[PDB]
Design goal:
alpha/beta; Amidase signature (AS) enzymes; 2 domains; two-stranded parallel sheet; 21 helices; 19 strands; hydrolase
């Protein structure tokens, strides 16, 4: 008749890892266009969705279960104990002044197996006049215009003004010529995801029409901070439409291709951001993360993806401002670059500063000795059955070796944990991320703009329109239950270590390049370890940790306490020291030559 719960009284020794996935068929092309038209049909549209939600256990959780907890509408973080061995940075400081402190937290720069270029490598080359930002911009523009990375069918960028990039590089070159560069980011090329505002480009979020209904008159908070440091905004990256996807498929501009294997997906939704950084075209990129959209493509393309704490970074000037799960984080080819870009874009909005009361941001002392005893004192939380729940055995073993290696060189202790109610976490997250997305686009869809969206988005919107208001309340009660679980886990361990994704980069079905696809079995394997950071606001970083049988990159996820970015950055720095990215992508471009 009904089920009952209680979260604070759950016996943790009786929690059982439920390992059934979300079953669904795999439709493509012509068989993908008609069934979407059935979902948009008046009568049978609701009947199909009501059956789908009733078969994957969503009606039982939402409408047949008495949840005793009160709704937690946004991540409510208690006061955290202060971190150990960090450098506190002022809450009211400029991005230039924070980069000066970040450089002090890095090991001494020593210009001495394949390796990506670092931001400090570009920065030293500019100051040694070995090259100039204008010359580096010409090389990038040449690599974009010859292979068509700003054009269909396989673009890194969907908005690119080469003449605008030259203007910034000319101003950056003149600053180095006069010997007064702005910061370490002066001349560094940063790509912006298409759901973040960056002048003079419009914002479409992967659509073809959003610029008509939503205009852009100023930069976003992150782009304004980057631009003030001297960074060169390259353009708007391709993405899965409106972030409603985890593969990167785009029926409008084409699917961005993985630099390791162009026949495979990059991961979503920051497809163009991760791919243009994995290919080495630019030093770093910015992307949004509502359901792993920063860490998922970072794992499948073999780069670093930092998902910061909710509210840590001002999202003003993006398509997901006002949401309860999304953040804006950096994507870079190394921990040092990811830590530098984070140092520039961080800072809460005025409203979030009051509503969330974040602790002053700190930086990790990446310079070990006198360090690496704080790393060894960290307790690593491992949910073994959750850890081993991967498609290929190579991923669980490659990440279990890092946990093994971290204990041999530093002394870290791996603690067996249990994360209860993972199925509830999926249900609570899908409705928490879809409801604000559909609400901010409903006036346009009602105006006839719904047809201009892709079939992959219209499939999600069809399911989103079936969510009632009472379902949202119940889901926020579940968000409190999972918050209490994770806050008690962080009373024992300091981080929760998992693989970032359950599978490596999947190949693109050729019938999916026509007008998208719908493969839940793949999107489920990709969002298995990332939802806890979005629903509960925790910071999570995806660090590469090697490759599998087919040489595809594997990433490890380090999820820490609220506002504990320095801990997840210092641990990932020790991880990448034991597992450096050594293989070169199939698609790669060596600028600075």
């Amino acid at each position: 008749y009904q089920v009952m719960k209680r979260a604070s009284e759950v016996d943790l020794s009786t929690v059982k890892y439920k390992a059934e996935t979300m079953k669904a068929p795999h439709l493509t092309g012509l068989s993908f266009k008609l069934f979407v038209n059935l979902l948009e049909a008046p009568l049978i549209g609701s009947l199909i969705v009501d059956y789908l939600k009733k078969d994957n256990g969503m009606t039982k959780i939402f409408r047949n279960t008495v949840i005793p907890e009160e709704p937690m509408f946004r991540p409510e973080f208690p006061s955290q104990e202060p971190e150990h061995d960090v450098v506190i940075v002022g809450e009211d400081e400029s991005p230039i002044d924070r980069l000066e402190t970040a450089l002090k937290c890095l090991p001494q720069y020593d210009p001495s197996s394949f390796r990506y270029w670092k931001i400090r490598d570009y920065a030293y080359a500019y100051r040694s006049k070995l090259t100039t930002p204008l010359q580096v911009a010409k090389r990038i523009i040449s690599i974009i215009e010859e292979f068509g990375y700003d054009k269909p069918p396989t673009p890194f960028l969907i908005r690119f003004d080469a003449n605008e990039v030259i203007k910034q590089a000319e101003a950056s070159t003149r600053r180095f010529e006069q010997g007064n560069p702005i910061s370490v980011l002066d001349g560094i090329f940063v790509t912006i995801k298409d759901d973040i505002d960056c002048l003079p480009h419009p914002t479409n979020g992967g659509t073809t029409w959003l610029h008509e209904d939503r205009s852009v008159e100023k930069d976003s908070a992150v782009v304004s901070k980057l631009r003030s440091c001297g960074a060169i905004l390259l353009g708007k990256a391709n993405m899965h439409e409106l972030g409603m996807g985890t593969t990167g498929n785009n029926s409008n501009y084409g699917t961005t291709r993985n630099p390791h294997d162009p026949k495979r997906y990059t991961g979503g939704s920051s497809s163009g951001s991760a791919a243009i950084v994995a290919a080495g075209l630019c030093s770093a990129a910015l992307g949004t993360d509502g359901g792993g959209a920063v860490r998922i493509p970072s794992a499948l393309c073999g780069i670093t993806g930092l998902k910061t704490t909710y509210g840590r970074t001002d999202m003003t000037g993006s398509l997901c401002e006002g949401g309860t799960v999304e953040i804006i984080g950096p994507l870079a080819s190394s921990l040092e670059d990811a830590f530098l870009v984070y140092a520039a874009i961080l800072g809460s909005s005025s409203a979030d500063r009051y509503n969330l009361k974040p602790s002053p941001p700190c930086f990790p002392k990446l310079l070990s000795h006198n360090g690496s005893n704080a790393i060894g004192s960290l307790r690593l939380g491992k949910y073994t059955k959750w850890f081993n729940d991967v498609s290929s055995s190579d991923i669980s073993d490659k990440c279990e070796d890092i946990l093994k290696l971290l204990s041999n060189n530093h002394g870290c202790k791996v603690v067996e944990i249990v994360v209860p109610e993972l199925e509830e976490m999926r249900a609570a997250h899908v409705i928490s991320i879809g409801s604000p997305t559909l609400s901010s686009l409903t006036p346009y869809c009602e105006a006839g703009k719904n047809s201009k969206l892709s079939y992959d988005t219209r499939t999600s919107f069809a399911i989103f329109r079936s969510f009632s208001a009472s379902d949202y309340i119940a889901a926020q009660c579940l968000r409190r239950r999972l918050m209490e679980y994770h806050l008690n886990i962080f009373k024992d361990v300091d981080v929760i270590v998992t693989p970032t994704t359950g599978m490596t980069a999947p190949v693109i079905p050729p019938d999916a390049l026509k007008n998208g696809e719908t493969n839940i079995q793949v999107t489920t394997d990709l969002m298995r370890f990332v939802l806890a950071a979005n629903l509960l606001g925790f910071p999570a970083i995806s660090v590469p940790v090697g490759y599998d049988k087919e040489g595809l990159p594997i990433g490890l996820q380090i999820m820490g306490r609220p506002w504990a970015e320095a801990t997840v950055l210092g641990l990932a720095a020790a991880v990448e020291e034991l597992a450096p990215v050594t293989k070169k992508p199939a698609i790669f471009y060596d600028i600075l030559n």
